[PDB]
Amino acid sequence: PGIAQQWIQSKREDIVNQMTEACLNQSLDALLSRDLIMKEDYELVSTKPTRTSKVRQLLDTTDIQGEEFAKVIVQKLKDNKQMGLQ
Amino acid sequence: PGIAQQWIQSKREDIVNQMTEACLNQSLDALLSRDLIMKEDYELVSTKPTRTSKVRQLLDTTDIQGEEFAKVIVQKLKDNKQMGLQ
Amino acid sequence: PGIAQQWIQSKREDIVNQMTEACLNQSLDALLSRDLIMKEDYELVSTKPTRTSKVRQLLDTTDIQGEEFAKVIVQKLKDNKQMGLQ
Amino acid sequence: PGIAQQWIQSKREDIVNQMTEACLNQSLDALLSRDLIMKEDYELVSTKPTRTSKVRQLLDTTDIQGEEFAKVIVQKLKDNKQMGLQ
Amino acid sequence: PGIAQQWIQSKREDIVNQMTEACLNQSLDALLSRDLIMKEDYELVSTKPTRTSKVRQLLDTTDIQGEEFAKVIVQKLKDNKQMGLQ
Amino acid sequence: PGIAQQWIQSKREDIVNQMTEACLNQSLDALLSRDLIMKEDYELVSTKPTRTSKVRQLLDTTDIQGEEFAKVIVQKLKDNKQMGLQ
Amino acid sequence: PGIAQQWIQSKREDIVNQMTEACLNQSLDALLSRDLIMKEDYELVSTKPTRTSKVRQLLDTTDIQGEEFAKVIVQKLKDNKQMGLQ
Amino acid sequence: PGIAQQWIQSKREDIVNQMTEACLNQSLDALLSRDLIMKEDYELVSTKPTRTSKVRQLLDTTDIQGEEFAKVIVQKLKDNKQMGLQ
Amino acid sequence: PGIAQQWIQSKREDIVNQMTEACLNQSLDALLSRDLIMKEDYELVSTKPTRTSKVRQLLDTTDIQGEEFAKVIVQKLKDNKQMGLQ
Amino acid sequence: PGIAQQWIQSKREDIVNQMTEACLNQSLDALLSRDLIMKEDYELVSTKPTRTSKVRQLLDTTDIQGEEFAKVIVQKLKDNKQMGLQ
């Protein structure tokens, strides 16, 4: 389940066609800052040639990683003036 | 039987060679928005290397899942200007 | 089958090595003008590094999308002084 | 969908071959004025060697960013005496 | 048996490591020109990640499809200055 | 194949290191005179920083565009006292 | 793990939007001075068209190369008056 | 077992996240120099989209190929100033 | 096997880090002069962003194309004062 | 490796910010005197708008070209009263 994952599964159809590739990559590179994502799934989500799987290979990784994963991907998506829901 | 499944079995031969892979994936990722499909059959239908089973592994999953499953896969196939039958 | 698709499958070997990448992109970006192609298969056909799949990932998308799709890709290929067959 | 995006997808084929590179850049640099676009997709849209992708890498970024993004790119395209539609 | 298939099974070990992927794809896309191959095995042979099965998934498809299939795959392999045997 | 393209593929190695950048540009700008090349591949061939791709991005564009394209690029290369072969 | 890599993964989100492209290139060309980086990954990190991957294709290369790699990339980032943390 | 394979299975977890993709490819292309690896598993290990399987599809190929295979992959990993163990 | 391919597989590790990108392109464009390479693998080897695959996507194409292919790529590498072995 | 290249990789960080653009160009034009560099990489290194890549696009070309290349670029850098190391 998860408390940080109350919303990213709820608006996954929102966050696939609204989170741009740099707002993807300003956060996904930030996931390697706390050693909080792994250091070899990064070149599996970045190596996707299209962006529609470059965002979703993160978006199922955040479905499987813990709530301590998604609690830091969310304010990196609220600091961008995109849309606001916690 | 089903009321939402009155049509997807009726035009399964239509929907295999007319529903493209992104119109597949704009709806199949939307199935995880309501927690309405599961979170581990998704990487079983997306991991199909060809598209002719990437669409049909959804299309038998919607044959087995309920009418509350297929009632939301249908207007995600009517909003796309493809073909119209309810 | 299709009536607009009477010709693009007929001369697919013609249209792969004769439709240039800008005549590709002057029409493929025009497919997003009527909301007539999707908004996330576009960065799957444009992200192809070579042009020989940058044209064909459209050319099978127009094999799977309807005749209302291919009826607008054809006069965008007849306004260019390339070759004329409807 | 979007209300500010009622028009930029509607006339994307217009705005690719009519919005010049400085009317591109007088607005795209203005997107960094409100911290309203990101500060590392800017050198991804400006680094495109041709102009036909220097305008469109903005034009799909405005397809994915919100209506608060496109509501400020539009009067920066109406103050220029080019063409008028809201 | 087959008369057009007198040679492609005879030099299958030749044609796997000598027919390059574009000479593969200049002919395999040409197989969809006469509606002569199907329109959903194409994205099963192209979706092979390696080329050593991207050529052979055609090369067993031409073992199972008729002599009217292989009679058109052969001069698309003789027009290329590669090797000549009918 | 082509009848006007009997020679430009035949002497492409000649025409890359013998057609200078202004004899490139006196003809490539002349291709926009008949609306005979497109109006957004022009700033893709001119934006090449080196001349060795500024000539060849035309020279593969004339490999893909028709014989009505190459039949007008040839006497713009025979009026210049460079070399004569039709 | 690494002792020189105690910090570059720690402030990777810092070093992506603060290390400029010449402070990138004054150090990345200096990595070829000791034969300490390879001589064919250099034109893979420099060939990135945007700077946001021109810095990060080094920044994951320093995640995978040893602590003898990152111990020389760090004082080339402390001699520049940018920010100081070892 | 093997004598050259005394170490690559011993530090496979080391060599997956420390051997970079060009130090992968400076050696894996060198394996085709002695005709010592095959000429159609090369485009099966290079076609892996991520690097974490682009290195390991070599790293199990060197688990199955002989000690004459691994005795030449090792000094191509000791000439690089990475880490030293025979 | 091949007689012209006695050497290019023998010194592939030489020819990857010694054949520069213009000595690549002065020969690879010359391969389209005799209609001797194809006209749609050219924009697959040139579209490689790095040079280390821009040379090798030719160097495996010459591993798969015939000895009549490699017999003309070799004196285009001996006329350049680089290194001499037939 | 190379014997003439014992030093230019050793002091590449020296030679990037110490070899001025005319001492670049008095030697790089001299490389076309013996037909010793090519005649179409010259307008790829000179067309670099900045000098920091106008010197380095030579400085990796001399990393890939032979020791007969670098043995003549060195005394053209020792005749200038700049710094002396062979």
Structural overview:
Ten copies of one chain form a homodecamer. Chain A has helices spanning 12-16, 21-28, 42-45, 51-54, 56-59, 61-64, 67-73. The first copy, chain A, is mainly alpha-helical. Chain A is globular. The two termini of chain A are 15 Å apart. Chain A binds chain D through residues 17-23, 25-26, 80-83, and chain D through 34-36, 38, 40-41, 44, 61, 64-66, 68. Chains A, B, C, D, E, F, G, H, I, J: This is Receptor-interacting serine/threonine-protein kinase 2. Chains A, B, C, D, E, F, G, H, I, J: Residues 1-86 form the CARD domain.
Largest sheet report of chain A = none
Number of domains of chain A: 1
Most extensive contact = A-D, 13 and 12 residues
- Which value, in Å, is the CA radius of gyration of chain A? 12 Å
Counted by DSSP, the helix tally of chain A is 7
Distance between the termini of chain A: 15 Å
Query: Which structural class do you get from the secondary structure elements of chain A?
Result: mainly alpha
Count of DSSP E strands of chain A?
A: 0
Helix share bin of chain A: 40-55%
Name the shape of chain A in a single word: globular
Organism (chains A, B, C, D, E, F, G, H, I, J): Homo sapiens
Protein name (chains A, B, C, D, E, F, G, H, I, J): Receptor-interacting serine/threonine-protein kinase 2
Subcellular location (chains A, B, C, D, E, F, G, H, I, J): Cytoplasm; Cell membrane; Endoplasmic reticulum
Domain CARD (chains A, B, C, D, E, F, G, H, I, J): 1-86
